[PDB]
Amino acid sequence: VEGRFQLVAPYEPQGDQPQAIAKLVDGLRRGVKHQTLLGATGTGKTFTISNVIAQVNKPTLVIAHNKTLAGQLYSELKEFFPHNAVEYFVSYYDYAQPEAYVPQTDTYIEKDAKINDEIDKLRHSATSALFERRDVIIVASVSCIYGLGSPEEYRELVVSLRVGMEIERNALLRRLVDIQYDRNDIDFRRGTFRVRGDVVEIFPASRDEHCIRVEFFGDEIERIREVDALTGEVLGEREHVAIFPASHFVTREEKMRLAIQNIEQELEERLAELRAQGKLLEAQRLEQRTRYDLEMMREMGFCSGIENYSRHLALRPPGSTPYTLLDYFPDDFLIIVDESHVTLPQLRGMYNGDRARKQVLVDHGFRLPSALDNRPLTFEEFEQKINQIIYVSATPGPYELEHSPGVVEQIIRPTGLLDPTIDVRPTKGQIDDLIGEIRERVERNERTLVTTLTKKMAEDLTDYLKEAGIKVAYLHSEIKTLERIEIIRDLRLGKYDVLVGINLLREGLDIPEVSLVAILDADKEGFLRSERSLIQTIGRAARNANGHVIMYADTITKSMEIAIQETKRRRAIQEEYNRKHGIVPRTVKKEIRDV
Ligand SMILES: [Zn+2]
Ligand SMILES: [Zn+2]
Hints:
With 595 residues, this protein is of the alpha/beta class. It folds into 4 domains: 1-149 and 315-413, Rossmann fold (3-Layer(aba) Sandwich), CATH 3.40.50.300; 150-250, Penicillin-binding protein 1b domain (Penicillin-binding protein 1b fold, 2-Layer Sandwich), CATH 3.30.2060.10; 251-314, Helix Hairpins; 414-595, 3-Layer(aba) Sandwich (Rossmann fold), CATH 3.40.50. It contains 18 helices and 22 strands. The longest helix is centred in the middle third of the chain and has 25 residues, at 340-364.
């Protein structure tokens, strides 16, 4: 009998959701490798996928492309599936800097930035959950393809307890040390164990307040409980309990003894080479650094930056494809790529960026060439790891369309809101045109978003608008993430009528009160004027029943034709739907937040 997904939604699926859920559920059951969910903004994409996942009962990886989004999906999925394991997997890269060297300014950028507790605790509960139960969803950054110690090792190395087993106290107290746990009775924190004579409390690497308690009565375990840390408040009463390793790079002693000698041999080979080409300075650096590391490994089985040695510790051949979080999933898992037009290129690029950064360190003598083997997957390797995949995006990239059997379309909104109309107007006299349009919106109590290509034009426009008597706020290209919310929140309140910015694709810009979106320089060259970015931008006017977009330009580029055509196509279909079902489109109300 399996642990299944139980989806908790106050609603039912609606619009063209029911049809889309069915195709993707049927796809996955027929056994399709690649499917694409082309879903317009404002339809329940996340809730459509949550319906797919709940119906297929597969462990699932959902890949997001940044800390913000992964966080959104996470909290969302955690509300949709509160009785199942919704997990969170990010790393150093989220907002930390790795090891690096700049050969001109002679600067070694240390890895220094302390390993933040919350994230670590989280990777562990994610990897342990994968082995413990089935109803798991893991929201991850592209870090789900970085080097991770072998899954079998982490698995095989668990201390697998059961009520009344033939085990000793100090035999277990040594077993937890083998698995990178420390004794700290004077300060109980996660990843620690406490010995109080015959009371042994272990703080799983995966937990917050929920620690474990194993007690003896001879050479046999008596009771095992889930006490609340620094409280003793009995919560659990398990008979079986598995305590997973405290690091994703732990290795049996025997493999470690042998890895170390392989490392010694690599060091000697690399030193001889370097000193043979006259890179004497580079030999000295590598020798000082590697020996110090090898000294920590021989003394206590680990060191800092042990990641660098992962291929050696795994005892695999040079050049081997790293193991990653993907290998930790069963063979029959499910991948959902959220915002695929951006997420897939990000994944695709990780390997070259990382290799570039590590090749410099190997050249200058900070690392052994084997450090290149601790790395993210190349896109091809990611490709072979796919069991079954769904791409989700309002504007699928070339890869997705190319490998999917057409697209599963989800265009209808639950309130009948339509994609906007689009006028394209000349650049000459654009500011007064725009002023007068904003004036109309202000009279109808509606707001406006404006995007210009450059920070100077943006700055000029804001002034030009303030002089006109219109309340406008400038959303500076790098402003306090906490102030963003404040200015946006104020536009909703009408403290501001217009809001000028360069990039309108950054989140929190979905505002029901916005009924007009002006795109200055619609025809210029720039990542923000592509087919995909324009559609994404036009969408900022899809939250209002009177949404309209104005592109100012001298010409009609290929990107413009495409976005305009697509927008026309979506609207007609939406209109055809409202006609058939008796729906009048109306603006989705939303309450405004505070502190
Ligand atoms: Zn219908
Ligand atoms: Zn292909």
